[PDB]
Amino acid sequence: GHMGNAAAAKKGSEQESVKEFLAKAKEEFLKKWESPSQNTAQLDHFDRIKTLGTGSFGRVMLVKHKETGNHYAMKILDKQKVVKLKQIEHTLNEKRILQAVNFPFLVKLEFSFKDNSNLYMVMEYVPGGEMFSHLRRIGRFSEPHARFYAAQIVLTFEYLHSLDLIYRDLKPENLLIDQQGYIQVTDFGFAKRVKGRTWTLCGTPEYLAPEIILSKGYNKAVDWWALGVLIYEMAAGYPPFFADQPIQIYEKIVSGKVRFPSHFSSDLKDLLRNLLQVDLTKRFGNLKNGVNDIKNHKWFATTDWIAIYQRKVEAPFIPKFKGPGDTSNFDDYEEEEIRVSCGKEFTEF
């Protein structure tokens, strides 16, 4: 066969150890899920440094903890602007997930609290910014570079899916790069802890699986489709399906056709044809052998999955880092004030 006896034995033992890990990790997750942490700090514990982002619901600020000197990213959501935007459930759920998960490629919620008017989530500051900026600057990543990131997403999805969590918003914009060059996944507002099927139209057009576009009940296989889109975009510098308008994007997604740049390796094209598979009964990640069809694919032949998990692999790229508190990998915003002074439904925060 393909594997000699010693190689088959080592692979089998590796897969059983993963199962042992996931069992223990689901037990830890459920304990925190059932008994979340609340109000582990307060606003005056922090100095405001810089606004890193803003939107209709709130802003994200670089803050420094006054006593430890540690920098954090503080998400500030205004309770009234969330209640009046149909986002209460997503915000409660995102905080519930973040305080319960534990994985080396998920940004860590360090503190959370609320005051009279705002919700606050204080997470470890990831100073390298989004993969998006680096990808657009460099143009495209080499296949070994793309594989380094892809392997982390594979493990992160393997973790989340074992918790019955579908992630649903994979894209370079949501992948932060830390000081060791590893990925930190941000944003769990669209994630849903559901076995079986779910129906919500959500995600980003370029990354939508066909079954989402087609108004089907769908399952965790949409995350594996999105991995195919991400691997393609990392290696090509542009996603597999694009157009002027989303409706034209959706027609290409559902057509079951994808074209590859001539520099894509044969192994990469084969992996991507199996992830960007419209037919659910044939899409990798969704078959009898689960994630192992992906981890055992030829394109990942050189990947030491445990070494990736242990963060022992030297990253192919380390963002420039002029020290703690460096803001250079983020844009510049007007520094609006944070004023205090909607208890209903936010009781659980």
Partner: peptide, 18 residues
């Protein structure tokens, strides 16, 4: 070319969710 078509798409910047 595909790269040229990508630039022409106007979808090279950060993409919002639906």
């Amino acid at each position: 070319t595909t790269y040229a078509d990508f630039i022409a798409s106007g979808r090279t910047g950060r993409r919002n969710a639906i």
